[PDB]
Amino acid sequence: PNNLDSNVSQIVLKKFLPGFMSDLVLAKTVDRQLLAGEINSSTGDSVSFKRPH
Amino acid sequence: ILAPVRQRIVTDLETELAHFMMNNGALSLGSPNTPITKWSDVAQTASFLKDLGVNEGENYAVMDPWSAQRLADAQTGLHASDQLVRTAWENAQIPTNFGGIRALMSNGLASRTQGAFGGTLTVKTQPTVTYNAVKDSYQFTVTLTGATASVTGFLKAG
Amino acid sequence: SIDSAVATYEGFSIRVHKYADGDANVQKMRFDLLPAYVCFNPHMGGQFFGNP
Amino acid sequence: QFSSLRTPTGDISGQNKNNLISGKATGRVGNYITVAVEYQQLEEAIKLNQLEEILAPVRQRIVTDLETELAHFMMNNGALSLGSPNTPITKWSDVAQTASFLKDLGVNEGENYAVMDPWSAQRLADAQTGLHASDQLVRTAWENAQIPTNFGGIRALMSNGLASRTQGAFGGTLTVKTQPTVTYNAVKDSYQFTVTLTGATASVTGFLKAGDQVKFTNTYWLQQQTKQALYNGATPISFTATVTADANSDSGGDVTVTLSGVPIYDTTNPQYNSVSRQVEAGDAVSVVGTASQTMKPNLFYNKFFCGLGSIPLPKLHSIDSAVATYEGFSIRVHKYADGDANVQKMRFDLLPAYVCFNPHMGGQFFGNP
Numbered sequence: 001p002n003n004l005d006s007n008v009s010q011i012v013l014k015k016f017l018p019g020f021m022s023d024l025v026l027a028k029t030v031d032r033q034l035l036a037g038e039i040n041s042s043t044g045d046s047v048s049f050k051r052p053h
Numbered sequence: 054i055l056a057p058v059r060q061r062i063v064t065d066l067e068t069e070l071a072h073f074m075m076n077n078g079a080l081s082l083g084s085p086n087t088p089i090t091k092w093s094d095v096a097q098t099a100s101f102l103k104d105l106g107v108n109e110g111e112n113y114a115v116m117d118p119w120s121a122q123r124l125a126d127a128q129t130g131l132h133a134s135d136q137l138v139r140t141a142w143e144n145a146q147i148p149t150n151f152g153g154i155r156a157l158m159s160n161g162l163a164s165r166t167q168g169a170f171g172g173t174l175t176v177k178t179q180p181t182v183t184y185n186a187v188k189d190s191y192q193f194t195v196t197l198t199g200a201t202a203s204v205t206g207f208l209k210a211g
Numbered sequence: 212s213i214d215s216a217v218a219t220y221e222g223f224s225i226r227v228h229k230y231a232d233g234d235a236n237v238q239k240m241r242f243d244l245l246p247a248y249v250c251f252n253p254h255m256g257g258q259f260f261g262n263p
Numbered sequence: 264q265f266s267s268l269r270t271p272t273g274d275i276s277g278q279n280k281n282n283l284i285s286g287k288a289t290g291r292v293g294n295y296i297t298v299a300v301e302y303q304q305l306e307e308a309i310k311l312n313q314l315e316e317i318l319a320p321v322r323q324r325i326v327t328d329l330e331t332e333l334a335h336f337m338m339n340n341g342a343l344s345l346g347s348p349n350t351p352i353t354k355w356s357d358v359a360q361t362a363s364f365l366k367d368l369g370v371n372e373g374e375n376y377a378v379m380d381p382w383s384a385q386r387l388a389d390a391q392t393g394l395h396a397s398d399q400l401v402r403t404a405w406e407n408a409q410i411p412t413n414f415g416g417i418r419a420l421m422s423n424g425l426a427s428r429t430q431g432a433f434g435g436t437l438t439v440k441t442q443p444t445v446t447y448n449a450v451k452d453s454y455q456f457t458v459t460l461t462g463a464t465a466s467v468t469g470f471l472k473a474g475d476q477v478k479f480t481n482t483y484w485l486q487q488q489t490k491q492a493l494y495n496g497a498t499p500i501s502f503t504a505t506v507t508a509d510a511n512s513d514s515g516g517d518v519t520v521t522l523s524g525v526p527i528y529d530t531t532n533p534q535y536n537s538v539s540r541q542v543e544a545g546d547a548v549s550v551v552g553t554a555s556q557t558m559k560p561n562l563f564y565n566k567f568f569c570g571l572g573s574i575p576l577p578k579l580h581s582i583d584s585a586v587a588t589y590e591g592f593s594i595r596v597h598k599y600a601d602g603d604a605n606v607q608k609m610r611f612d613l614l615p616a617y618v619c620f621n622p623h624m625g626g627q628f629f630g631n632p
């Protein structure tokens with residue numbers, strides 16, 4: 001009956017396991033050009049575009 | 054430790070887009086209890102956009118993993134083009150254009166709950182819908198009558 | 212009087228602010244983003260299901 | 264994993280920031296694997312020729328008994344479940360459901376595998392002889408009864424060495440007796456939890472056996488990143504866990520079992536939830552399959568689910584030895600003898616090691632009724 005357990009360490013290696021993930025689809029198919037850079041500090045919180053006649 | 058923080062932001066950006074779009078768009082096709090199975094379940098969306106007059110840019114339909122699969126299962130059953138059945142037998146892929154509309158699979162997609170309604174509903178007062186009232190929004194208030202006695206959350210957003 | 216930096220992932224920008232707390236000996240960091248939305252025409256989209 | 268607040272201004276004053284809660288997975292060393300032989304000096308003289316051929320199969324015994332224990336190890340940990348043992352694999356949509364379930368939960372890294380026995384691979388081979396279009400693809404299965412490398416958008420493999428399991432005799436209608444403590448603090452170092460069950464049959468030895476699968480009807484899997492429940496067509500996908508060891512039903516019909524996979528639902532740290540709600544005392548549950556059935560399960564898993572390793576063994580002193588690898592595993596042999604009984608002894612050894620990184624990345628699958 002040896003007892004050697006105090007000769008050694010409990011080691012946690014420095015690496016992580018793969019987590020889960022999700023995919024981004026809606027984000028990349030809507031219109032992103034029209035509204036870009038259009039709202040700045042001269043404009044207040046909103047801006048408008050024209051409906052066709 | 055903090056590397057995941059950025060993709061939490063983006064994940065939560067796009068769960069809002071799902072809700073924003075869901076609370077605005079006025080069009081509806083088919084019954085909400087029934088899952089997408091037939092080819093003509095995706096195809097009805099291209100043709101309704103068409104019949105209504107929309108011509109500009111592309112059109113997208115977006116469904117979950119489980120629907121995408123039953124659609125490939127439908128394509129393993131085609132009788133004619135062997136490049137189109139091989140792809141789905143190996144890969145469970147469907148093509149880029151499907152039904153005459155650009156079709157896409159997304160596991161991030163939001164859900165929503167109906168909210169408890171009952172009774173035979175009618176309008177209480179004729180609303181005012183002319184081009185001059187709704188000109189700037191395309192939204193309008195209407196008051197419905199003949200509902201269940203009193204309920205919190207009788208109709209929920211969406 | 213608070214220290215910052217800005218990063219890019221997915222073609223979005225995120226500020227980060229690093230402050231602390233004097234009396235509780237504590238360090239705090241927040242990452243934030245402002246989206247904008249537009250609905251051009253409500254009649255051009257919607258929700259679809261199967262036909263039984 | 265983190266969560267986020269959504270506010271008109273951005274004022275977070277009265278609210279809760281994310282805590283940091285670490286967790287870890289742990290590997291362990293297993294039993295030795297040993298094959299030992301002996302024979303008299305008299306036999307070495309008159310009776311043993313080609314002794315070197317007499318012990319060729321000895322090293323493949325070692326590696327065979329490694330693969331058989333590995334298969335049990337997996338079958339006992341992975342929580343996921345598809346189909347049910349009463350229906351054999353037939354349709355294309357059987358192998359296919361597994362790849363799209365791994366994607367709906369969000370497994371993105373490495374490669375996914377499905378593994379089945381010869382009888383299953385044959386029923387998938389004549390499903391492939393029925394295709395109406397692809398010319399080559401039917402000819403191959405008609406000739407050779409083979410199926411492609413990728414099948415259903417997962418990578419499919421056949422193996423004749425694979426373990427079986429017996430269900431064990433369960434009956435009556437079951438419900439949970441008390442609330443389990445499932446928060447991320449309790450389960451974060453293991454991913455296992457104990458729960459007591461009610462309404463079982465009076466006194467039964469082996470009421471549930473290691474490898475069974477208990478299903479919680481009203482508690483649903485989430486998507487792990489997005490946190491929205493999972494729907495397959497009309498119906499939600501229930502949560503399911505695996506019985507890790509044998510469990511007996513005491514008189515009065517109670518059963519206390521340890522399960523692998525956890526229905527985490529945490530109020531204080533909701534960012535870690537697995538599932539749509541809190542399992543409460545009085546919830547219906549049921550065991551997948553029929554009472555005393557036996558069978559060989561099919562396994563589907565992500566690459567980082569289980570892992571395997573082996574440990575160099577040092578040399579005993581005053582004894583002679585050498586190392587030889589077969590299938591990329593190193594095996595010691597010690598050759599020693601007993602001077603008084605006049606016999607000769609050889610032993611061949613290997614030490615394995617096993618991790619289960621995540622229980623929620625693998626499981627067992629059957630067909631759909």
Ligand SMILES: [Cl-]
Nearest residue numbers: 131132394395
């Ligand atoms: Cl035909």
